[PDB]
């Protein structure tokens, strides 16, 4: 299994809503008896490894934004988070894995990582991730709406 990142950069003005997307291409589930821990977090383009360091998204860690479910299922974060923090992590049957961000601010800018962790035989060695930038801008130079740039 692998994770595909359709867009490498997201450019948005303050006040917008934006949805970051990772596509879980090819589930590779030899039947059931397998669950998937899926989460989002912020990180850096470090020297050694990327998506290594785990920084929060609006004071919410990877554990706050996590989804745990079997391959057959979909999953969503609770309404409490959406109302309070303005974050909604979502995952459906058709590959798609997303996080949605309400009322964008300059503090939201950064490098965002999706994680998908295959859990099987009480073991979770098989893990993949994606990365994409978000740039929240300000002023009259900033665009009317959000804009995403395709990956290479």
């Amino acid at each position, epitope marked *: 299994f692998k994770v595909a990142t359709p867009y490498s950069l997201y450019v948005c003005p303050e006040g917008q809503n934006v949805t970051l997307t990772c596509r879980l291409l090819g589930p590779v589930d030899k039947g059931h008896d397998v669950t998937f*821990y899926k989460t989002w977090y912020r990180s850096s383009r470090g020297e050694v490894q990327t998506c290594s360091e785990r*920084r*929060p998204i609006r*004071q919410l860690t*990877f554990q*706050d934004l996590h989804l745990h479910h079997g391959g057959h299922q979909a999953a969503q974060t609770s309404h409490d988070l959406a109302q309070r923090h303005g974050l909604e992590s979502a995952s459906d049957h058709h590959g798609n894995f997303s996080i949605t961000m309400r009322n964008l601010t300059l503090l939201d800018s950064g490098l965002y990582c999706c994680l998908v*962790v295959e859990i099987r035989h009480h073991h*979770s*060695e098989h893990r993949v991730h994606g990365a994409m930038e978000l740039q929240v801008q300000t002023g009259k130079d900033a665009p009317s709406n959000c804009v995403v740039y395709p990956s290479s």
Partner: antibody, heavy 122, light 109 residues
Framework: EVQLVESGGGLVQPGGSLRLSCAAS????????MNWVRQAPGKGLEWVSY????????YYADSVKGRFTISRDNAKNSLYLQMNSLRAEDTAVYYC???????????????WGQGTLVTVSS | DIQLTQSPSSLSASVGDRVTITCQAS??????LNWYQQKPGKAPKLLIY???NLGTGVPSRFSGSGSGTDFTFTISSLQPEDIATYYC??????????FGGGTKVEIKR
């Protein structure tokens, strides 16, 4: 300074129940994730259970799952551990521990309590 | 479940000697390894977080390094007050958060 006072431990018979409390002070208990960690007499540390800041995420070790139930009262700056169907093996000192939080979103156990001994014996 | 093999289980070294403890993770754990100190009677106390980052008010003789699978904890010059059992602890994404088993540090006199 941050301070974490466990209480509620003591003697209890096999199959019995018992409830630990962890009294937090010197920080906004609301904002931080809390764990229970047990250490059996003269043995290493074992993690027991995890609890989110507003309790949305909860995890247990398999050895305690089904039996122990974690909770917190953010109004009372309090963390609890209901313990049911206790066995010989559950005999241990039980520490509540607060994860270093902050803007970095750390996950290490920077603040521990002094612990409360639980004995399981007839 | 990630197993942490911690080496050695016990240890004896003189005042001033370098002391190095090793933690071996059964999976890649990136740098998600915390190092605690448990003095006899006292509870555990965090010294290092995320492999190499020192805690506040922690003597600079204490240090740590490592990534992936192989990790170390090092006391530059062992002092009499550093008598304790040291544990390593993995801080992975998924819940079963396991500990080393520990290295007892006694001092040679």
């Amino acid at each position: 300074e941050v301070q974490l006072v466990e209480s509620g431990g003591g003697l209890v018979q096999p199959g019995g129940s018992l409830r630990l409390s962890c009294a937090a002070s010197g920080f906004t208990f609301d904002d931080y994730s809390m764990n229970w960690v047990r250490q059996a007499p003269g043995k290493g540390l074992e993690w027991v259970s995890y609890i989110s800041s507003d309790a949305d995420t909860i995890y247990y070790a398999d050895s305690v799952k089904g039996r122990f139930t974690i909770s917190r009262d953010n109004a009372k700056n309090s963390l609890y551990l209901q313990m049911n169907s206790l066995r010989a093996e559950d005999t241990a000192v039980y520490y509540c521990a607060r994860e270093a939080g902050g803007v970095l979103g750390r996950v290490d156990f920077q603040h521990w309590g002094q612990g409360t001994l639980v004995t399981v014996s007839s | 479940d990630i197993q942490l093999t911690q080496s050695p289980s016990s240890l004896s070294a003189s005042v001033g000697d370098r002391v190095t403890i090793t933690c071996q993770a059964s999976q890649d754990i990136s740098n998600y390894l915390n190092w605690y100190q448990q003095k006899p009677g006292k509870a555990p106390k965090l010294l290092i977080y995320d492999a190499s980052n020192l805690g506040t008010g922690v003597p600079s003789r204490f240090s740590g390094s490592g990534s992936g699978t192989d990790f170390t904890f090092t006391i530059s010059s062992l002092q009499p007050e550093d008598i304790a059992t040291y544990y390593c602890q993995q801080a992975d994404f998924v819940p079963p958060w396991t500990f080393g088993g520990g290295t007892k540090v006694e001092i040679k006199r």
